[PDB]
Amino acid sequence: SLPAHLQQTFSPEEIQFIVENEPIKIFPRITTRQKIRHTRWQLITTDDKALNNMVAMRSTEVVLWIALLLKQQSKCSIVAPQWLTTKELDRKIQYEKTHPDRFSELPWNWLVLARILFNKAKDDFHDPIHELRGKIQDLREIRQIKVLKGLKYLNESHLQLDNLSLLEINELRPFITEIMDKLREIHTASLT
Amino acid sequence: NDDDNTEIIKSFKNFILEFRLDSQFIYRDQLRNNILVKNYSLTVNMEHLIGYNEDIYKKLSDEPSDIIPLFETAITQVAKRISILSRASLPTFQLILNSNANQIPLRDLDSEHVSKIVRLSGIIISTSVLSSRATYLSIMCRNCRHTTSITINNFNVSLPRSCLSNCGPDPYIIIHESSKFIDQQFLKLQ
Amino acid sequence: ELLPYPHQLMKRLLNRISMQSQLIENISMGFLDNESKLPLLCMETELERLKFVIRSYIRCR
Amino acid sequence: NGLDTNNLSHQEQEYLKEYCDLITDLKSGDLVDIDLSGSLVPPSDVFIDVRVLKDAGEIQTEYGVFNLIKDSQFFVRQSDVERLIQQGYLQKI
Amino acid sequence: KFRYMPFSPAGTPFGFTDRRYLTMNEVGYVSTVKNSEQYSITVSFFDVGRFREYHFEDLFGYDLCFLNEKGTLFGQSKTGQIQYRPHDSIHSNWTKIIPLQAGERITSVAATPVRVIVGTSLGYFRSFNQFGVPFAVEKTSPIVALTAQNYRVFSVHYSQFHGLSYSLSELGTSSKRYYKRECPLPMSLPNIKDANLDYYNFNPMGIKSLFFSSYGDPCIFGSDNTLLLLSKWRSPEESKWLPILDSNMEIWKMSGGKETTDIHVWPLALAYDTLNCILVKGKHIWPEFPLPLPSEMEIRMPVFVKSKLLEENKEIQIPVSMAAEEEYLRSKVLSELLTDTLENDGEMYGNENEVLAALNGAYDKALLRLFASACSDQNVEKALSLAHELKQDRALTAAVKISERAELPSLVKKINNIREARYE
Amino acid sequence: MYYGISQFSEAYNKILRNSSSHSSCQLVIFVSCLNIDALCATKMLSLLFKKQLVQSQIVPIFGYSELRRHYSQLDDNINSLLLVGFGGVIDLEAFLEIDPQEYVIDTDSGEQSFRRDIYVLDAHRPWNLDNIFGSQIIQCFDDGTVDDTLGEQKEAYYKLLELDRKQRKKQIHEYEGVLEEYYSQGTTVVNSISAQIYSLLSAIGETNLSNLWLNILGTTSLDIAYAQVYNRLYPLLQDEVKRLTPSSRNSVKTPDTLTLNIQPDYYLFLLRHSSLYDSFYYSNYVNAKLSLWNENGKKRLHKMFARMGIPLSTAQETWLYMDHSIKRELGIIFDKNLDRYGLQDIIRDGFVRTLGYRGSISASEFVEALTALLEVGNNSAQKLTNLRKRWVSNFWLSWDALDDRKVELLNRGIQLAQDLQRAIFNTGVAILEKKLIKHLRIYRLCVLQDGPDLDLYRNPLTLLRLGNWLIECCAESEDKQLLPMVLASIDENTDTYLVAGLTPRYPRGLDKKPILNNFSMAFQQITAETDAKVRIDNFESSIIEIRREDLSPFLEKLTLSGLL
Ligand SMILES: [Zn+2]
C-alpha cells in the first residue's frame, strides 16, 4: 500500500511539503482588512487571522504555501528570511570553515527554502540572487565535506549530528541507517 | 608576466565557480563528482566557455600550449577549495575539451594549423603500449648535490645545461624516487 | 513499530474535513446563485494538502 | 484498480478480486472523505496545464464540462483531472 | 546662493542614467524614462487589488507628480503645464496651463478628493477643483514641498527672506479649516562624495520625503535622515515636533556599528509605528528602477548615547536602563497620538482601542523596569516620581511588590498613599 | 468600431465577468495553427488568463471546416470564445449557423444580452461587415481600421439594412454599389494580433519582458510578407523595450540576467547559429540581390567575403567559434562593403534577447525556429485528416519552444530551420534553372510536377517559404514587371495539387501604398462556377487544394478571369 521508495524515508517533495508549512513574512499587495467606516479565508490548518487582516505593504506572517500561492499571482512579495541574506550566509560560511567538526546552526529548512524562494520569488531578494545561489552552493559543498568526514565514524552504538539539515539528513538516511543496522547485526550476533 | 598568469588562473577559477545554467553549477558538480570517484580531470564544453566570457576563449585558442596548463592549475585550486577543509594531496588535474567547432578533415591539416586547437575525425588504426612521462622531476647535481626540480606541462623542457650554483660541464641527474610521472599513449588516426 | 492510532485527533480532523468540504461547496453554490475567489482557492488547496497528509498517514500504517 | 491476467494463478486472480473489493470497501465506509487510493506525491499546485493526449468527447465534472479534443490544452484545477491523468488521457505534470 | 527646484515626494534624480522616479508614497510609485526626445511614464501601485498600473508617452516631459488614491497629478515645472488623471477613467483626464512669470516655475503639486493644488517659486498658490475649475489664488512664501492625505494638506515653504516654515490645512467638502499657517519648521537643511552634491542639485532643500501617518499626522524626513512627526497638531497651542526616528543611529545600531556607511534610508510612509522605506546600498543615495522591497523600521526615540553603546559592545545590544527609557518614551508618545486620533477621528479598522490598551501595558511595564533600577540605587524620590507615572492601578501594585523586594518601606508607604488616592 | 483599441479593457472585463470562475472551465480559445502571430497572441493571452487564474481551453485549428466542427460540439456552459488569427473576413454568424434568438437572454429596455460571446482577434482585412456591424454576438477587436476608413461602408450597410420608387431605386442601387466595391477588395494583414494583445496588456497594466518578447516575436513574424506593417509597429516596440529595460549600466553578464536589447540584427539567415557564409547563402534577400541561384552569384558572394578581408574558412565557421575579432569588427566590415554590392538593406537594428550565459537569439532567428517547428515538428479524406492532425500537433512544439525551460526544443527548431531552408533553396534553383516559371499574361505560374523534397510542400507554410524565396528574387530584378504569382505542388499521395496565390511586392528597400491579394476571391469565383472538386477551407484563403485532373481547366478559367 506504500511504494518501496517511500517505505522508510521521505521523498524530496514530502520534505518540501513539510517546509511549506513553516510561517514566512510577506508584504501583501492586496488589502483585506475591511474598514469600519464577502468571502473570508476560513482556514482549518493554519492562522486564518493574518490573511483576513492584510493591508498593502504592511508586512505580515503567513504559512509558506499560501505565500507561494499569493506569489504565483502578483498579490504579495515574500520577504527572504534574515539568515538568507548575503552577509549572514557569509558569516555561516566563515563558521563552517572555522570549526572543522561542527555544522553551523543554519535552520533545518535552509536548502529547501533556498530552492523554493530562488525559484518562486527570484525578484524579492534585496541582495543579488546570483551571489545568494553562489553562497548556498558554498555552504552545501563545505557541509558535504564535513558529512564525508563524519561517516568514517559510524558505530554500532549511536551518532550525533548537531545542525544537519532536514534535506541533508533525508538524503543520507537510507545509507546511514542501513549501514549502522548492519554494524549492529554484526555486533549483536557476536554476543553470547 | 606572473601577475598576468595569475589573472588568467583566477579567471578560469571564476569560470568553474560561477558558470551556471538552469540553477545548476554544472562544473562545480562535475568537479566534485569526479573527485568522489577519484578521477582527477574535468570535461569542459567550450560552448560554455565562449558563452561565459569569449575573451577567455580567445586567449585559449590563440595559444593553447601556454593557456591549457593555467586552466589545469585553476581546476586543481578549485578542486581543493571544494573538497578539503583547508585550515583544519591531489595531482595536477587533466583538462578535457568538448567542442562543436567545424571539423578540419585529416588531409587538410597543414602548416597554418600549427599550435591551434583542432577538431578532426578518423579511424584509430593502432594504439601503442602505455609509457611514463614526467610531470614533476626531482633533480640533483652530480658533484655538489645541489637539488632543484622541474615541474612540467606536457604540451611543449630538458635538464639544465650546467649547475645552478668548478661543478662539471653537464651535471644534473634525476631522483627517480621523488619524481612524479603520468601515463602517455600513442595512437595512429587514419 | 506500528505506533498507536491517534483516535480522538483523527475523529476530530475527519469531522473538520467534512464540514470544511460542506462549507466550500456552500460557497460554490452561493457563487452560482464583495465577490473574490482567492480565499476560496486557499480553502480548496488547504483541503487538498490536509487530505494528502491523512491519505499518506493511513496508507503508511 | 482501487481508483497480462493470464500470468496469475486462478487463486491469485480471485485473491486480487477480493483485495480490490477490500480496498474499495475502505474508501467507501468511514474515512471516505479522503480517496484513500489517491496519489502519494504531495499536491504541488492547485491549477495545472494539461494537454489532451487522447480524444474523449464532452464529459461533465461537478459544475461544468471538458470537451477532450485531441491535442487541445486546458488550464484547470488539478483535483478535477487527476483521474484522467491516471487513466492516460491527459499528458502534463 | 540658492535656486528653486521642482519637488515630488521621494522622487529621485536621473544621475548618470536615463530613468528616474517622479514620486513614491504609501499608494505606489511613478517613474519616467528619457525615451529619446520624449518621456515614457509608468504609474505603479502597491495595492494591485484596488488599482491597476498604466503608462503613457509624455511629450511635455513632466518633472512633477503626485499620487493619491483617487488620481495622479502631473506637472511640467518650466512651462506651467499640468495634467490630472483619475484612476477609474470614468471621470475624464484634464489638462491646464497655469501662468508663470519669466523665470518662475511650479515647485510642487498636490491633489485631494475635491481639489488640485499648485505652488510656484514666486509663491503663488493656485487651487482648482478636481474637474479643473479655478477656485482661488493666494500668495504665500514659495512652496518648496507639498502633499496631502484625504482632505488634509501639509505644505513646506522657504525663501531667503522668510526662512523655513510650514502650513497645515483641512480643506474638506465643507468647513474649510486651517490649523497652522507658515509656522517655522524645525527641520535641518543640508550643508554646503559627489552623489550627495548631485542629489542636492536635484533637491536643494534635502527633504527626502514628506507625508502623513496612516492615522493622519504630518511627517517629514530631512537631510539629517531624522523622521519628524508633528504631535497634537489638532490643537495648535500644544503642537510639537517629535524626532521619532534618527535613522542614522538605527542603521549604525542594527549593523553592529563599525562606522557603517553606504547604506541609506529612503522613506515611503510611517503606517502606525513602522517606517516603510527602501534601504539603498552603494554610493548613490536613492533607489534604482527595479524598486527594492520597502523594508520596515520601527520608530526609536533618540535616547541612545553612542559612546555608552561603544563602551558596552566594543550585533549591538542595549542596556536595560536605556531600553526602558526608550520603551517608556515611545509608548507614551504613540499612546498620545492614538488617543488624539480616537478622540477626534475615531476608529477606522476597529482594533485601535485594543492596540492602545496593549500599548499602555508596555508603558507601565517600562516604568516598572525603570522603577526597579531606581530602587536598586535606593533613591526613594526617584522611585516615587517614577511610581506617579503609572496608569493602571493594578500595575501600581507591582511597584509595592518591587519596593518590598528592595527593602524600602518608605517607598511602600508612599505607594500605598498613591493607591488610596488612585482609588478615587 | 466593435471594440476599438481604446476599449479592449471593456471586452476583457466582460470576459472576466461572464466566463471566469473557480467552479468551472468556461472559456475556449480557438487559435489558427500554422500562424506564428496567432500563436504568440495566444501564448500572451494564456499567460494573462493563468495569472488571473481563469480556467480555459486552447484548441489549435487548421481551417474553417475544423472550426465549424469544433464550434458545433461546444457545450452551452462555454459562454465565451476567442477566435485568434482568423474569422474576421467571413460572416461568422452565418458560417457558424448562429441564430441570435437561440442565444438571447434578458432584454430589459431597447436592449439584448446573450448567453455566449464570440470575440474575434484577427488582423486580416477587409473585415466582413456582418461581423463588424450586422452581428450582436460577434465582437471584433478592431485596430482602428473601421473608424479610420469605413464610414461610407457603415452608412451604406445601415441604410441598406433599413431599406427593406425612384428614391428607393437610387438608394438601393447606390449602396449595393458601395458594398460590392468594398467587397472584392484583395485580402491583406494590417496589424499583428500579438501587438493587439499587447495593447490590451498595456490597458490592464500587465506588461513585462516576457509578454514584450512574445509581442516582438508575433510582430517579427510579419516582417517577410508584410514589411510595411512591421515598419509601422517597430517604433512602439522600441518604446516598450526602453520602458521595461532595467536602469543598470556596465551590467556584467550574470547567469540570472535576462536582457532584451535593440542592436544590429542583420537581414542574414540564422546568423548566430549558421556560419557567416551560410547566413548569407540561404538568405532570401541575399539570393535575390546577388542572383545566388547560379554560379555567377556564387562567385559574387565569394568576391564579397574576399573583399571584406574574411578568409572563406573563417566565413564557414559556426558563428560561436567564428573568430572573435571578426565578430567584434563585423559591423564595420559590413558598413565598408555592403553598399558596394547593393546589399545595404542587410543593415538593420532588431531585437536581440540573451539570457544568462546561454547565447543570444534575435526575434528573426527565434521566429525561424518556431516556423520550422510548425512545419516539420513531429482513404483520401482519412489520409488528409491524419496529415492535418500532424500540423495541429506541431503547434505544441512551437508553443513549448516559447518557454526558456525548453531551449533544447528551440535548438531542434534551429536545426530544422536550417535544413528546411536548404530544401527550399535546392527547390528554388531547380525552379529557376529549369525555367519552370511560365509567364502567363496576367500572372506568373510555377507548378512543381516532380522533384526531391516534394513531400514537404504539402504543408502550407513550407510552400509559402518557397513562394517568398521566389518573390524576393523576382522583386529585386529590374527587367521583370511586378505581377501576382501562383505556386502549385502535386501531392502524389492524395493526387491533389496544393495551390497558393501569392502577391508581388516592391524591392525590400523602396518606399508606396500596399499591394493586396486578390487570389482570395478569384479562387472563390472560379470555385463557384466550376464543376471541379477544390477545397477552399484554409484560413489563408489565398491557398486551395485541388485534384490533379482539374488543375489545368481551373487555371485556364482563372487566366480568362479579369479579377487578378
Ligand atoms: Zn653543482
Swiss-Prot record, chain A:
Keyword set includes Repeat: no
One GO CC term on file: nucleus
Repeat in keyword set: no
Main location: nucleus
GO terms of biological process kind: DNA-templated DNA replication; double-strand break repair via break-induced replication
Alphabetized UniProt keyword annotations: DNA replication, Nucleus
UniProt xrefs under CDD domains: GINS_A_psf2 (cd11712), GINS_B_Psf2 (cd21694)
Location in or out of the cell: Nucleus
Similarity-based family: Belongs to the GINS2/PSF2 family.
Complex formation: Component of the GINS complex which is a heterotetramer of SLD5, PSF1, PSF2 and PSF3. Interacts with PSF1 and SLD5.
Record function comment: Functions as part of the GINS complex which plays an essential role in the initiation of DNA replication by binding to DNA replication origins and facilitating the assembly of the DNA replication machinery.
Name of the protein this chain belongs to: DNA replication complex GINS protein PSF2
Native organism: Saccharomyces cerevisiae (strain ATCC 204508 / S288c) (Baker's yeast)
Swiss-Prot record, chain C:
Full-sequence portion shown in this chain: 75 to 147 of 294
Family: Belongs to the GINS4/SLD5 family.
Domain of life: Eukaryota
Subunit (UniProt): Component of the GINS complex which is a heterotetramer composed of SLD5, PSF1, PSF2 and PSF3. Interacts with PSF2.
Role played: Required for DNA replication. Functions as part of the GINS complex which plays an essential role in the initiation of DNA replication by binding to DNA replication origins and facilitating the assembly of the DNA replication machinery.
Localization in the cell: Nucleus
Protein name listed in UniProt: DNA replication complex GINS protein SLD5
From Swiss-Prot, chain D:
Locations listed in the record: Nucleus
Note: Present with 1431 molecules/cell in log phase SD medium.
Stated role: Required for DNA replication. Functions as part of the GINS complex which plays an essential role in the initiation of DNA replication by binding to DNA replication origins and facilitating the assembly of the DNA replication machinery. Required for the chromatin binding of CDC45.
SUBUNIT field: Component of the GINS complex which is a heterotetramer of SLD5, PSF1, PSF2 and PSF3. Interacts with PSF2.
Family per record: Belongs to the GINS1/PSF1 family.
Protein name per Swiss-Prot or TrEMBL: DNA replication complex GINS protein PSF1
Lineage, broadest ranks: Eukaryota, Fungi, Dikarya, Ascomycota, Saccharomycotina
Name of encoding gene: PSF1
Swiss-Prot record, chain F:
InterPro entries according to UniProt: CDC45 (IPR003874)
UniProt entry keywords in alphabetical sequence: Cell cycle, DNA replication, Nucleus, Phosphoprotein
A biological-process GO annotation: double-strand break repair via break-induced replication
GO CC, alphabetical: CMG complex; DNA replication preinitiation complex; nuclear replication fork; nucleus
Gene Ontology molecular function terms on file: chromatin binding; DNA replication origin binding; single-stranded DNA binding
Localisation: Nucleus
Family of this protein: Belongs to the CDC45 family.
Subunit structure: Assembles into a complex with MCM5/CDC46. Interacts with MCM10.
Protein task: Required for initiation of chromosomal DNA replication. Acts at the origin of replication. Also has a role in minichromosome maintenance.
Note: Present with 1730 molecules/cell in log phase SD medium.
Name of this chain's protein: Cell division control protein 45
Organism field: Saccharomyces cerevisiae (strain ATCC 204508 / S288c)
